[PDB]
Amino acid sequence: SNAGAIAKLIPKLGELLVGEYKLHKGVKKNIEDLLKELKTMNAALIKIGEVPPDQLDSQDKLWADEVRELSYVIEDAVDKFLVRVHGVEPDDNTNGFKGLMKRTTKLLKKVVDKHGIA
Question: Residue ranges of the Disease resistance N-terminal domain (predicted)?
Answer without folding.
Answer: 6-87
